[PDB]
Coordinates of all heavy atoms in Angstrom, one line a residue:
Chain B
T56 N 13.2 75.6 108.6 CA 12.7 77.0 108.7 C 11.8 77.3 109.9 O 11.5 78.4 110.2 CB 11.9 77.3 107.4 OG1 12.7 77.0 106.2 CG2 11.6 78.8 107.3
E57 N 11.3 76.2 110.6 CA 10.6 76.4 111.8 C 11.4 77.1 112.8 O 12.6 76.9 112.9 CB 10.1 75.1 112.3 CG 9.0 74.3 111.5 CD 7.7 75.0 111.5 OE1 7.6 76.1 112.2 OE2 6.7 74.5 110.9
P58 N 10.8 78.0 113.6 CA 11.5 78.9 114.5 C 12.4 78.1 115.5 O 13.6 78.2 115.5 CB 10.5 79.7 115.2 CG 9.2 78.9 115.1 CD 9.3 78.2 113.8
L59 N 11.8 77.2 116.3 CA 12.5 76.5 117.4 C 13.0 75.2 117.0 O 13.7 74.5 117.8 CB 11.6 76.4 118.6 CG 11.3 77.8 119.3 CD1 10.2 77.6 120.4 CD2 12.6 78.3 120.0
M60 N 12.6 74.7 115.8 CA 13.1 73.3 115.3 C 14.2 73.6 114.3 O 13.9 73.6 113.1 CB 11.9 72.6 114.7 CG 10.8 72.2 115.7 SD 9.5 71.2 115.0 CE 8.5 70.9 116.5
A61 N 15.4 73.7 114.8 CA 16.6 74.0 114.0 C 17.6 72.9 114.2 O 17.9 72.5 115.3 CB 17.2 75.3 114.3
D62 N 18.1 72.4 113.1 CA 19.1 71.3 113.1 C 20.5 71.9 113.5 O 20.8 73.1 113.2 CB 19.3 70.7 111.7 CG 19.5 71.7 110.6 OD1 19.5 72.9 110.9 OD2 19.7 71.3 109.5
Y63 N 21.2 71.1 114.3 CA 22.5 71.5 114.8 C 23.6 70.8 114.0 O 23.6 69.6 113.8 CB 22.7 71.1 116.3 CG 21.6 71.8 117.1 CD1 20.4 71.2 117.3 CD2 21.9 72.9 117.8 CE1 19.4 71.7 118.1 CE2 20.9 73.5 118.7 CZ 19.7 72.9 118.8 OH 18.7 73.4 119.6
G64 N 24.6 71.6 113.5 CA 25.7 71.1 112.7 C 26.7 72.2 112.5 O 26.6 73.3 112.8
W65 N 27.9 71.7 112.0 CA 29.0 72.6 111.7 C 29.0 73.2 110.3 O 29.8 74.0 110.0 CB 30.3 71.8 111.9 CG 30.4 71.2 113.3 CD1 30.4 69.9 113.5 CD2 30.5 71.9 114.5 NE1 30.5 69.7 114.9 CE2 30.5 70.9 115.5 CE3 30.5 73.2 114.9 CZ2 30.6 71.2 116.9 CZ3 30.5 73.5 116.2 CH2 30.6 72.5 117.2
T66 N 28.0 72.8 109.5 CA 27.8 73.5 108.2 C 27.2 74.9 108.4 O 26.6 75.2 109.5 CB 26.9 72.7 107.3 OG1 25.6 72.5 108.0 CG2 27.5 71.3 107.1
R67 N 27.4 75.8 107.5 CA 27.1 77.2 107.6 C 25.6 77.4 107.8 O 25.1 78.4 108.4 CB 27.6 78.0 106.5 CG 27.2 79.5 106.6 CD 27.7 80.1 107.9 NE 27.4 81.5 108.0 CZ 28.2 82.5 107.6 NH1 29.4 82.2 107.1 NH2 27.8 83.8 107.7
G68 N 24.8 76.5 107.2 CA 23.3 76.6 107.3 C 22.7 76.1 108.6 O 21.5 76.3 108.8
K69 N 23.5 75.5 109.5 CA 23.0 74.9 110.7 C 23.6 75.6 111.9 O 24.7 76.2 111.8 CB 23.4 73.4 110.7 CG 22.9 72.7 109.5 CD 23.4 71.2 109.6 CE 23.0 70.4 108.4 NZ 23.4 69.0 108.5
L70 N 22.9 75.6 113.0 CA 23.5 76.1 114.3 C 24.6 75.3 114.7 O 24.6 74.0 114.5 CB 22.4 76.2 115.3 CG 21.3 77.2 115.2 CD1 20.4 76.9 114.0 CD2 20.4 77.3 116.4
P71 N 25.6 75.8 115.4 CA 26.7 75.0 116.0 C 26.2 74.0 116.9 O 25.3 74.2 117.7 CB 27.6 76.0 116.6 CG 26.7 77.2 117.0 CD 25.7 77.2 115.9
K72 N 26.7 72.7 116.8 CA 26.3 71.6 117.7 C 27.2 71.5 118.9 O 28.3 70.9 118.8 CB 26.2 70.3 116.9 CG 27.5 69.9 116.2 CD 27.2 68.7 115.3 CE 26.9 67.5 116.1 NZ 26.8 66.2 115.3
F73 N 26.8 72.1 120.0 CA 27.6 72.0 121.2 C 27.6 70.5 121.7 O 26.7 69.8 121.4 CB 27.1 72.9 122.3 CG 25.7 72.8 122.5 CD1 25.2 71.9 123.5 CD2 24.8 73.6 121.9 CE1 23.8 71.8 123.7 CE2 23.4 73.6 122.1 CZ 22.9 72.6 123.0
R74 N 28.7 70.1 122.4 CA 28.8 68.7 122.8 C 27.7 68.3 123.6 O 27.2 69.0 124.5 CB 30.1 68.5 123.5 CG 31.4 69.2 122.9 CD 31.5 68.9 121.4 NE 31.6 67.5 121.1 CZ 32.8 66.9 121.2 NH1 33.9 67.5 121.5 NH2 32.8 65.6 120.9
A75 N 27.1 67.1 123.3 CA 26.1 66.5 124.1 C 26.2 65.0 123.9 O 26.8 64.5 123.0 CB 24.7 67.0 123.7
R76 N 25.5 64.3 124.8 CA 25.6 62.8 124.8 C 24.7 62.3 123.7 O 24.8 61.1 123.3 CB 25.1 62.2 126.1 CG 26.1 62.5 127.3 CD 25.7 61.8 128.5 NE 24.4 62.2 129.0 CZ 24.2 63.2 129.8 NH1 25.2 64.0 130.1 NH2 22.9 63.5 130.2
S77 N 23.8 63.1 123.1 CA 22.9 62.6 122.0 C 22.2 63.9 121.5 O 22.2 64.9 122.2 CB 21.9 61.6 122.5 OG 21.0 61.3 121.6
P78 N 21.6 63.8 120.3 CA 20.8 64.9 119.8 C 19.6 65.2 120.7 O 19.2 66.3 120.9 CB 20.3 64.4 118.4 CG 21.4 63.5 118.0 CD 21.8 62.8 119.2
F79 N 19.0 64.2 121.4 CA 18.0 64.4 122.4 C 18.5 65.2 123.5 O 17.8 66.1 124.0 CB 17.4 63.1 122.8 CG 16.4 63.2 123.9 CD1 15.0 63.5 123.6 CD2 16.8 63.1 125.3 CE1 14.1 63.6 124.7 CE2 15.8 63.2 126.3 CZ 14.5 63.5 126.0
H80 N 19.7 64.8 124.0 CA 20.3 65.6 125.1 C 20.6 67.0 124.7 O 20.4 68.0 125.5 CB 21.6 64.9 125.6 CG 22.1 65.5 126.8 ND1 23.4 66.0 126.9 CD2 21.6 65.6 128.1 CE1 23.7 66.5 128.1 NE2 22.6 66.2 128.8
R81 N 21.0 67.2 123.4 CA 21.3 68.6 122.9 C 20.0 69.4 122.9 O 19.9 70.5 123.3 CB 21.9 68.5 121.6 CG 22.2 69.9 121.0 CD 22.9 69.7 119.6 NE 24.2 69.1 119.7 CZ 24.5 67.8 119.6 NH1 23.5 67.0 119.2 NH2 25.7 67.3 119.7
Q82 N 18.9 68.7 122.5 CA 17.6 69.4 122.5 C 17.2 69.8 123.9 O 16.6 70.8 124.2 CB 16.5 68.5 121.8 CG 15.4 69.3 121.2 CD 15.8 70.0 119.9 OE1 17.0 69.9 119.5 NE2 14.9 70.6 119.2
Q83 N 17.4 68.9 124.9 CA 17.1 69.1 126.3 C 17.9 70.3 126.8 O 17.4 71.2 127.5 CB 17.3 67.9 127.1 CG 17.0 68.1 128.6 CD 17.4 66.9 129.4 OE1 17.8 65.8 128.9 NE2 17.2 67.0 130.8
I84 N 19.2 70.4 126.4 CA 20.0 71.5 126.9 C 19.5 72.8 126.3 O 19.5 73.8 126.9 CB 21.5 71.2 126.5 CG1 22.0 70.0 127.3 CG2 22.3 72.4 126.7 CD1 23.3 69.5 126.8
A85 N 19.2 72.7 125.0 CA 18.6 73.9 124.3 C 17.4 74.4 125.0 O 17.2 75.6 125.3 CB 18.4 73.7 122.9
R86 N 16.5 73.5 125.4 CA 15.2 73.9 126.1 C 15.6 74.5 127.4 O 15.0 75.5 127.8 CB 14.3 72.6 126.3 CG 13.8 72.1 125.0 CD 13.3 70.6 125.2 NE 12.8 70.1 123.9 CZ 11.5 70.2 123.6 NH1 10.6 70.8 124.3 NH2 11.1 69.6 122.4
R87 N 16.5 73.9 128.2 CA 16.9 74.4 129.5 C 17.5 75.8 129.4 O 17.1 76.7 130.1 CB 17.8 73.5 130.2 CG 18.4 74.1 131.5 CD 18.9 73.0 132.4 NE 20.1 72.2 131.8 CZ 20.0 71.1 131.2 NH1 18.8 70.4 131.1 NH2 21.0 70.5 130.7
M88 N 18.3 76.0 128.4 CA 19.0 77.3 128.2 C 17.9 78.4 127.8 O 17.9 79.5 128.4 CB 20.0 77.2 127.1 CG 21.3 76.5 127.5 SD 22.6 76.6 126.3 CE 21.8 76.0 124.8
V89 N 17.0 78.0 126.9 CA 16.0 79.0 126.5 C 15.1 79.3 127.7 O 14.7 80.5 127.9 CB 15.2 78.5 125.3 CG1 14.1 79.5 124.9 CG2 16.1 78.3 124.1
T90 N 14.7 78.3 128.5 CA 13.8 78.6 129.6 C 14.5 79.5 130.6 O 13.9 80.4 131.2 CB 13.5 77.2 130.3 OG1 12.8 76.4 129.4 CG2 12.5 77.5 131.5
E91 N 15.8 79.2 130.9 CA 16.6 80.1 131.8 C 16.7 81.5 131.3 O 16.6 82.5 132.0 CB 18.0 79.5 132.1 CG 18.0 78.7 133.3 CD 17.7 79.4 134.6 OE1 18.1 80.6 134.7 OE2 17.1 78.8 135.5
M92 N 16.9 81.7 129.9 CA 16.9 83.0 129.3 C 15.6 83.7 129.6 O 15.6 84.9 130.0 CB 17.2 82.9 127.8 CG 17.5 84.2 127.1 SD 19.2 84.6 127.0 CE 19.1 86.2 126.1
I93 N 14.5 83.1 129.3 CA 13.2 83.7 129.5 C 13.0 84.1 131.0 O 12.6 85.2 131.3 CB 12.1 82.8 129.0 CG1 12.2 82.4 127.6 CG2 10.7 83.5 129.3 CD1 12.3 83.6 126.6
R94 N 13.4 83.2 131.9 CA 13.2 83.4 133.3 C 14.0 84.6 133.8 O 13.5 85.5 134.4 CB 13.6 82.2 134.2 CG 13.4 82.4 135.6 CD 13.3 81.0 136.4 NE 12.9 81.2 137.8 CZ 12.4 80.2 138.5 NH1 12.3 79.0 138.0 NH2 12.1 80.4 139.8
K95 N 15.3 84.7 133.4 CA 16.1 85.9 133.6 C 16.8 86.1 132.2 O 17.7 85.3 131.8 CB 17.1 85.7 134.7 CG 18.0 84.5 134.6 CD 18.9 84.3 135.8 CE 20.1 83.4 135.5 NZ 19.6 82.0 135.1
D96 N 16.4 87.2 131.6 CA 17.0 87.6 130.3 C 18.5 87.2 130.1 O 18.9 86.6 129.1 CB 16.8 89.1 130.0 CG 15.3 89.5 130.0 OD1 14.5 88.6 129.6 OD2 15.0 90.6 130.4
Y97 N 19.3 87.5 131.1 CA 20.7 87.3 131.0 C 21.0 85.8 131.4 O 20.5 85.3 132.4 CB 21.5 88.2 131.9 CG 21.6 87.8 133.4 CD1 22.8 87.1 133.8 CD2 20.6 88.0 134.3 CE1 22.9 86.7 135.1 CE2 20.7 87.6 135.6 CZ 21.9 87.0 136.0 OH 22.0 86.6 137.3
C98 N 21.9 85.2 130.6 CA 22.3 83.8 130.9 C 23.8 83.7 130.5 O 24.1 84.2 129.4 CB 21.4 82.8 130.2 SG 21.9 81.1 130.6
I99 N 24.6 83.1 131.3 CA 26.0 82.8 131.0 C 26.2 81.4 130.6 O 25.9 80.5 131.4 CB 26.9 83.2 132.2 CG1 26.5 84.6 132.7 CG2 28.3 83.1 131.8 CD1 27.4 85.1 133.9
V100 N 26.6 81.2 129.3 CA 26.7 79.9 128.8 C 28.1 79.7 128.2 O 28.6 80.6 127.6 CB 25.6 79.6 127.7 CG1 24.3 79.4 128.4 CG2 25.5 80.7 126.7
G101 N 28.7 78.5 128.3 CA 30.0 78.3 127.9 C 30.1 77.5 126.6 O 29.5 76.4 126.5
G102 N 30.9 78.0 125.7 CA 31.3 77.3 124.5 C 30.4 77.5 123.3 O 29.8 78.6 123.2
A103 N 30.2 76.5 122.5 CA 29.4 76.7 121.2 C 28.0 76.9 121.5 O 27.2 77.3 120.6 CB 29.6 75.4 120.3
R104 N 27.5 76.6 122.7 CA 26.1 76.7 123.0 C 25.6 78.2 123.1 O 24.4 78.4 123.0 CB 25.7 76.0 124.3 CG 26.5 76.4 125.5 CD 26.1 75.6 126.7 NE 26.4 74.2 126.5 CZ 26.1 73.2 127.4 NH1 25.5 73.6 128.6 NH2 26.4 72.0 127.2
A105 N 26.5 79.1 123.2 CA 26.2 80.5 123.2 C 25.5 81.0 122.0 O 24.4 81.6 122.1 CB 27.4 81.4 123.6
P106 N 26.1 80.8 120.8 CA 25.3 81.2 119.6 C 24.0 80.5 119.4 O 23.0 81.1 118.9 CB 26.3 80.9 118.4 CG 27.3 80.0 119.0 CD 27.4 80.4 120.5
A107 N 24.0 79.2 119.7 CA 22.7 78.5 119.7 C 21.7 79.1 120.6 O 20.5 79.3 120.2 CB 22.9 77.0 120.0
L108 N 22.1 79.4 121.8 CA 21.1 80.1 122.7 C 20.7 81.4 122.2 O 19.5 81.8 122.3 CB 21.8 80.2 124.1 CG 21.0 81.1 125.1 CD1 19.5 80.5 125.2 CD2 21.7 81.1 126.4
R109 N 21.6 82.2 121.6 CA 21.2 83.5 121.0 C 20.2 83.3 119.9 O 19.2 84.1 119.9 CB 22.4 84.3 120.6 CG 22.2 85.7 120.3 CD 23.2 86.3 119.4 NE 23.2 85.8 118.1 CZ 22.3 86.1 117.1 NH1 21.4 87.0 117.4 NH2 22.4 85.6 115.9
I110 N 20.4 82.4 119.0 CA 19.5 82.2 117.9 C 18.2 81.7 118.4 O 17.1 82.1 117.9 CB 20.2 81.2 116.9 CG1 21.4 81.9 116.2 CG2 19.1 80.8 115.8 CD1 22.2 81.0 115.3
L111 N 18.2 80.8 119.4 CA 16.9 80.3 119.9 C 16.1 81.4 120.6 O 14.9 81.4 120.5 CB 17.2 79.1 120.9 CG 17.8 77.9 120.3 CD1 18.3 76.9 121.3 CD2 16.7 77.2 119.4
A112 N 16.8 82.3 121.3 CA 16.2 83.5 121.9 C 15.6 84.3 120.8 O 14.4 84.8 121.0 CB 17.2 84.2 122.8
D113 N 16.3 84.6 119.7 CA 15.7 85.3 118.6 C 14.5 84.6 118.1 O 13.5 85.3 117.8 CB 16.7 85.5 117.5 CG 17.9 86.4 118.0 OD1 17.9 86.8 119.2 OD2 18.8 86.7 117.1
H114 N 14.5 83.3 118.0 CA 13.3 82.6 117.5 C 12.2 82.7 118.4 O 11.0 82.8 118.0 CB 13.7 81.1 117.2 CG 14.7 80.9 116.1 ND1 15.3 79.7 115.9 CD2 15.1 81.8 115.2 CE1 16.1 79.8 114.8 NE2 16.0 81.0 114.4
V115 N 12.4 82.7 119.7 CA 11.4 82.8 120.7 C 10.8 84.2 120.6 O 9.5 84.4 120.7 CB 11.9 82.6 122.1 CG1 10.9 83.0 123.2 CG2 12.2 81.1 122.3
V116 N 11.6 85.2 120.4 CA 11.1 86.6 120.2 C 10.2 86.7 119.0 O 9.2 87.3 119.0 CB 12.2 87.6 120.2 CG1 11.7 89.0 119.8 CG2 12.9 87.6 121.5
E117 N 10.6 86.0 117.9 CA 9.8 86.0 116.7 C 8.5 85.3 116.9 O 7.5 85.8 116.5 CB 10.6 85.2 115.6 CG 11.8 86.0 115.1 CD 12.6 85.2 114.0 OE1 12.0 84.2 113.5 OE2 13.7 85.6 113.7
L118 N 8.5 84.2 117.7 CA 7.2 83.6 118.0 C 6.3 84.5 118.8 O 5.1 84.6 118.6 CB 7.5 82.3 118.8 CG 8.0 81.1 118.0 CD1 8.7 80.1 119.0 CD2 6.8 80.4 117.3
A119 N 6.9 85.2 119.8 CA 6.1 86.1 120.6 C 5.5 87.2 119.8 O 4.4 87.6 120.0 CB 7.0 86.6 121.8
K120 N 6.3 87.8 118.9 CA 5.9 88.9 118.1 C 4.8 88.4 117.1 O 3.8 89.1 116.9 CB 7.0 89.5 117.3 CG 8.0 90.2 118.1 CD 9.2 90.8 117.3 CE 8.7 92.0 116.5 NZ 9.8 92.6 115.8
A121 N 4.9 87.2 116.6 CA 3.8 86.6 115.8 C 2.5 86.5 116.6 O 1.5 86.8 116.1 CB 4.3 85.2 115.2
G122 N 2.6 86.0 117.8 CA 1.5 86.0 118.7 C 0.4 85.1 118.3 O -0.7 85.2 119.0
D123 N 0.5 84.3 117.3 CA -0.5 83.4 116.9 C -0.7 82.3 118.0 O 0.2 82.0 118.8 CB -0.2 82.7 115.6 CG -1.2 81.8 115.1 OD1 -2.3 81.7 115.7 OD2 -1.0 81.1 114.1
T124 N -1.9 81.8 118.1 CA -2.2 80.7 119.0 C -1.4 79.5 118.7 O -0.9 78.8 119.6 CB -3.7 80.3 119.0 OG1 -4.5 81.5 119.3 CG2 -4.0 79.2 120.0
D125 N -1.2 79.2 117.4 CA -0.3 78.1 117.1 C 1.1 78.3 117.5 O 1.8 77.4 118.0 CB -0.3 77.8 115.6 CG -1.8 77.6 115.1 OD1 -2.6 77.0 115.8 OD2 -2.1 78.0 113.9
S126 N 1.6 79.6 117.4 CA 2.9 79.9 117.8 C 3.1 79.8 119.3 O 4.1 79.2 119.8 CB 3.3 81.4 117.4 OG 4.4 81.8 118.1
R127 N 2.0 80.2 120.1 CA 2.1 80.0 121.5 C 2.1 78.6 121.9 O 2.8 78.2 122.9 CB 0.9 80.7 122.2 CG 1.0 81.0 123.6 CD -0.3 81.5 124.2 NE -0.1 82.0 125.6 CZ 0.1 83.2 125.9 NH1 0.2 84.1 125.0 NH2 0.3 83.6 127.2
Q128 N 1.3 77.7 121.2 CA 1.3 76.3 121.5 C 2.6 75.7 121.2 O 3.1 74.8 122.0 CB 0.2 75.6 120.8 CG -0.1 74.2 121.3 CD -1.4 73.7 120.7 OE1 -2.2 72.9 121.4 NE2 -1.7 74.0 119.4
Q129 N 3.3 76.1 120.1 CA 4.6 75.6 119.8 C 5.6 76.0 120.9 O 6.4 75.2 121.3 CB 5.1 76.2 118.5 CG 6.2 75.3 117.8 CD 5.7 74.0 117.4 OE1 6.3 73.0 117.6 NE2 4.5 73.9 116.7
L130 N 5.6 77.2 121.4 CA 6.5 77.7 122.4 C 6.2 76.9 123.7 O 7.1 76.6 124.5 CB 6.4 79.2 122.7 CG 7.4 79.8 123.7 CD1 8.8 79.5 123.2 CD2 7.1 81.2 123.9
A131 N 4.9 76.6 124.0 CA 4.6 75.8 125.2 C 5.1 74.4 125.0 O 5.7 73.8 126.0 CB 3.0 75.7 125.3
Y132 N 5.1 73.8 123.8 CA 5.7 72.5 123.6 C 7.2 72.6 123.9 O 7.8 71.7 124.5 CB 5.5 72.1 122.2 CG 4.1 71.6 121.8 CD1 3.7 71.5 120.5 CD2 3.1 71.3 122.8 CE1 2.4 71.1 120.2 CE2 1.8 70.9 122.5 CZ 1.5 70.8 121.2 OH 0.2 70.4 120.9
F133 N 7.8 73.7 123.4 CA 9.3 73.7 123.5 C 9.8 74.0 125.0 O 10.5 73.1 125.5 CB 9.8 74.8 122.6 CG 11.3 74.8 122.5 CD1 12.0 74.0 121.7 CD2 12.1 75.7 123.3 CE1 13.4 74.0 121.6 CE2 13.5 75.7 123.2 CZ 14.1 74.8 122.3
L134 N 9.3 75.1 125.6 CA 9.8 75.4 126.9 C 9.4 74.5 127.9 O 8.5 73.6 127.7 CB 9.4 76.9 127.2 CG 9.8 78.0 126.3 CD1 9.3 79.3 126.8 CD2 11.3 78.0 126.1
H135 N 10.0 74.6 129.1 CA 9.6 73.8 130.3 C 8.6 74.4 131.2 O 8.0 73.8 132.0 CB 10.9 73.4 131.1 CG 11.9 72.6 130.4 ND1 11.6 71.9 129.2 CD2 13.2 72.3 130.7 CE1 12.7 71.3 128.8 NE2 13.6 71.5 129.7
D136 N 8.5 75.8 131.1 CA 7.7 76.5 132.1 C 6.6 77.3 131.3 O 6.8 78.3 130.6 CB 8.6 77.5 132.8 CG 7.9 78.0 134.1 OD1 6.7 77.8 134.2 OD2 8.6 78.6 134.9
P137 N 5.3 76.9 131.5 CA 4.2 77.6 130.9 C 4.1 79.1 131.4 O 3.7 80.0 130.7 CB 3.0 76.8 131.3 CG 3.3 76.0 132.5 CD 4.8 75.7 132.3

Side-chain angles (χ1 to χ4, degrees):
Chain B
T56 309
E57 290 289 2
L59 290 170
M60 296 185 176
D62 54 358
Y63 302 83
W65 305 114
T66 60
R67 180 53 179 270
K69 308 176 179 180
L70 290 66
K72 57 185 295 184
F73 51 88
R74 315 311 300 275
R76 294 187 297 276
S77 174
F79 175 86
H80 188 240
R81 182 176 296 95
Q82 209 72 356
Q83 180 184 356
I84 291 166
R86 295 162 179 270
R87 172 160 62 261
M88 291 189 302
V89 178
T90 303
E91 267 296 326
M92 187 96 182
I93 303 304
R94 182 160 190 163
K95 58 183 195 301
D96 298 327
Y97 86 96
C98 184
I99 308 183
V100 286
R104 56 182 63 182
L108 172 53
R109 194 198 66 78
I110 294 172
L111 294 168
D113 293 3
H114 293 171
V115 168
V116 172
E117 290 177 13
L118 285 159
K120 293 180 71 176
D123 183 6
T124 301
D125 304 326
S126 169
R127 196 190 192 92
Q128 194 168 216
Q129 201 68 227
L130 187 60
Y132 288 166
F133 189 81
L134 301 184
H135 296 348
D136 197 348

